Amino acid sequence: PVVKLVNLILTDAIKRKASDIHIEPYERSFRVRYRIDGVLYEVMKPPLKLKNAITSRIKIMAELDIAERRLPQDGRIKIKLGGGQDMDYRVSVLPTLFGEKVVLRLLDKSNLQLDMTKLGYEPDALHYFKEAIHKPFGMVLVTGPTGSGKTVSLYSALGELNKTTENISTAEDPVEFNFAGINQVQMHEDIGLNFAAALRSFLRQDPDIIMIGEIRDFETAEIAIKAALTGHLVLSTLHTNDAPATINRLLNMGVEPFLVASAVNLITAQRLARRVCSECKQPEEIPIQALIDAGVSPDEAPSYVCYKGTGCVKCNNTGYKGRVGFYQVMPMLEEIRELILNGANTAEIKRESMRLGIKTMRQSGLTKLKEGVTSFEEVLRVTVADD
Amino acid sequence: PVVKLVNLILTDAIKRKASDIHIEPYERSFRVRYRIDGVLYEVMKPPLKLKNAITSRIKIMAELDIAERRLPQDGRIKIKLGGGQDMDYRVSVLPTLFGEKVVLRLLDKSNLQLDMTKLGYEPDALHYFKEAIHKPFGMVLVTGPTGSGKTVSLYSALGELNKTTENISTAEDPVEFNFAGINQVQMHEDIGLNFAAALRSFLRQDPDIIMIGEIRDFETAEIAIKAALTGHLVLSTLHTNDAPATINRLLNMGVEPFLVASAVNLITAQRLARRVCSECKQPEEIPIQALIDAGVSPDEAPSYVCYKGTGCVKCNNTGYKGRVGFYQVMPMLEEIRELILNGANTAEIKRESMRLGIKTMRQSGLTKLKEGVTSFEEVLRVTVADD
Amino acid sequence: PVVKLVNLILTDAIKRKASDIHIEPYERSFRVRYRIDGVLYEVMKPPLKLKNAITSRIKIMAELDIAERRLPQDGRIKIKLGGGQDMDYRVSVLPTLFGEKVVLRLLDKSNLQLDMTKLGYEPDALHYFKEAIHKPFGMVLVTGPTGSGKTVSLYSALGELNKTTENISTAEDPVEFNFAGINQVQMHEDIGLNFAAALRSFLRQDPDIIMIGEIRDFETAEIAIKAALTGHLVLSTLHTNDAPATINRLLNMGVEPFLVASAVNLITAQRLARRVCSECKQPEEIPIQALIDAGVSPDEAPSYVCYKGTGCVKCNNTGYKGRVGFYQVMPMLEEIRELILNGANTAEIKRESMRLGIKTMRQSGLTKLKEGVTSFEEVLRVTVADD
């Protein structure tokens, strides 16, 4: 009955066509609630009676951590039919006093679209990104938090590059989207297939462009560096606040700055914020000083028309519907490289990139605010200030 | 024999409407003190020789190990007093050289009052609080020291707001009563779940109603006020003297003024003062001007029949029996928002709330004096004059 | 002869009013030294055959391990030779290269006055100190070395606060005197009871007034600040050169100015300086300019009447006998608070404090010089000039 019970619990939430799934255990109750169009409904009460006797066994059956019931966890679930027309869930686990509560929010690979022109890049930034992904070598780091649009931007680059003249092979943990003509390896760390082993196999597979799901340790980073310096364009990912903090993250990991300065051609940082609801969007009164204090460049300010959804069902009573990406696309220009040779810190890199005209994710969010697709509060929710 | 005596001690604290029990060893003495209506009284001087065995006994009731008498310990005790009559205790024991000091904190909503009109909210304050907690988004802040009835007031607000349609998440320090259906996280710094990380998980847990235990740094504050503006109901606390001093805490840490002004609907501050004992209360010829100087309106002064209990056993020969809440309930009125955007200080905001009719906590207490419910000295003891 | 000699070593210290006894064996000598008013004098050169015998004898007096003579040992002795408290001694055995040196620390509360008005406070300073110990919350720091009457000042405050209405918790390493009603904790770090654990534990003990033995880091400093800010009266110590540099020290430590301004009510610094002996006291024609150089404002200069002891047996032929306390009391004035909030350093706080009437220990000593109880040179010896 335990095998059936675990199968029932996992299957029912998926089965009932819920827009958000809330699984909440308590001291005396254990409930499932569906958020449908911004509103929660209690949808199921599993029994308290079988919780403790068959505890560890089910936790092993659902491939969950049987020993940990105390800390938050965050992930992604991409479910494809083979390819990219994949329905996916953003999964968040939270430790309540009587067990872990999980919240699942639905999204799609294509509703958040893979056209690099549709990703929100400024013309210089879009130029640098397209120019960067079409180079024969170097490192491109797409940075941002979880749920920030990273997989779409990298895949947008892969689509831009997927041509019959080049051999594309990717190593992902896991593979988010399938591409015919691209040799995609999903990491199977258990059998020894991790990012390092897959990169080395790619390196034994006569590769031209190598994609690694993530730079996890300095050794894998170093192998990626090797692949980049031997003549391959290597693209990978880190979870950081912005592009320069990714620099400081690798420097803090122990990589010499000059390797950072030499191997990386472009670092982008990004985000997903909610787009104002087109049904209830209204212009919103926001003081000019708060927008200036939040990071907007002086020339875009007077033009801003900030919209806010009053909150309807298509925005989950949030006033926002869909997502918008806010980007800071900083190229590793040769002067910046010289600065590394002159020992500049990451903060100096940030100062110089702003000096070079690179708008931050905050300024790009304020740009989205300017076009009236997001609100200033969304800009503040998803990005940090440039001040 | 001694165990039974201990049971009597714990029953008597409840019977005497004590809020705290203190089992106190000294170098050469041992005494038991109850905090009754917020004030401690020496109630027992047990022999020092038996105290540690008694302490050892408490650990069995807490399912704690009697063997360890050398480390600080903290826990809970559930005692089954018959039927639904069960009693939770937050217990902290500390082993000094000459014995263990034990502190007991009663955990029973039965002892608590839950009707918000019965909490001490003035009709203006109750009205403004209800108006604040029933808005679809924004922040409501309840200030006062620990044990000032903040937990009772918030428990009443969440109960007002406790719907299946909302994802309610609370971060608490500590939990004083358990509600099924509310996602309650208790802080545990040793494993990494703090206010900032928990707040970000709440923003990722599809929240509707958010309660944050305490504000530690600027990061968590900015996240919470922006979560309020995003379309979440956010509750939190500060130890301030009034709502404006809480404001100024927020201003000095760096939250942009429009965020505070626009995401905060309302701020309450609240104290507890003892009620004049109904048995021994006698009119106290408190000069009416002293009442006015303390914050009584001029018209109500001569009407005041100020009472003080001369003292009887019902009030522990103190003249006071029970407590009452003094509330200053200041909604984040737009004029208050204009002041936030203009950088106003604590006194100006408090002055405007009073100008707008927000009774301060001192004035609320003197009104309680007018009703003969509390004495002038208790109002004076827990509130400062409005001056 | 060795037992009688040892008794002479312990008793002549009583007749000599010594603070410490040092019994030191050497290769070519053997001596007994008394500490009188902070200065050591040789009082006996007992026979070197008894070098180890006298010091080994004290172990026997201390109920210490005679079999071990190679390792440092520490114990306690209770001797009944008088005073106000028993002649208790803390014994420390050190195996030097020429025998065991034993040091005995004389313990007697009556060696210091516990009345606050007899601790040497000036009336305005005593008033501000009492006002400070009676506010419901905040932090007050008393700086000075141990034995400068700091613990007695604290104990005097505790006696003023030792009511059955307050929960008093102290963390001391160790507890010098015990007070009924005051919950005192001796630190025992071998079992996990350090200063940090005891503060956080007091905070779990429902405290009202909290005493801490020592501030050891920023982390503990933060817990302390928030305890003084969360409705507790917090008293603790550090040894710093003055109040303004203690300010700059904490600012350098990392505490936020607003928490500093909100939690600190008052900072005192205190030393015990030697009092000129009245018998050999003679007026000393100290030039007025030396006093102005020492720090008195020039308009007060001509009025100073400097005194000095010519030396007699009561003063060890030093001209001084006993101690008076030199206090410098900087209340956390609003002017001083505003200095905090603008990141002020030691110098401008010092300038403001002299502008605002904050007396230095040097100004208080010159006042005692004017009063003729201490001399200018002891002041110049143990204090540095202001002006």
Author numbering:
A (entry chain B), B (entry chain A), C (entry chain F): 182 to 568
Provide the authors' original text about this structure.
PilT is the PilT/VirB11-like ATPase that powers T4aP depolymerisation. PilB is the ATPase that powers pilin polymerization in the T4aP. T4aP polymers can be rapidly depolymerized at the base, resulting in fiber retraction. Adjacent packing units adopt one of two conformations: open (O) or closed (C).
To determine whether this homogeneity was observed in a Proteobacteria PilB, we performed cryoEM analysis of PilB from G. metallireducens (PilBGm) in the absence of nucleotide. Projection of the PilB CCOCCO crystal structure revealed that the PilBGm top-view 2D class averages were consistent with the CCOCCO conformation. It should be noted that the N-terminal domain of PilBGm, known as the N1D, MshEN, or GSPII domain, was not observed in the 3D map although its presence was confirmed by trypsin digest followed by mass spectrometry (98% coverage from the His tag to the C terminus). It may be that in the absence of its binding partners, this domain is disordered relative to the core motor domains of PilBGm. Thus, cryoEM analysis reveals that PilB preferentially adopts the CCOCCO conformation in multiple species. This is in contrast to PilTGm and PilTPa that both adopt OOCOOC and OCOCOC conformations in similar conditions. We also showed by cryoEM analysis, in accordance with the recently determined PilBTt structure, that PilBGm uniquely adopts the CCOCCO conformation in a noncrystalline state. Consistent with the distinction between CCOCCO and OOCOOC conformations promoting PilB-like and PilT-like functions, respectively, we note that while PilB adopted the CCOCCO conformation in solution here and elsewhere, the equivalent C2 symmetric conformation adopted by PilTGm and PilTPa is the OOCOOC conformation.
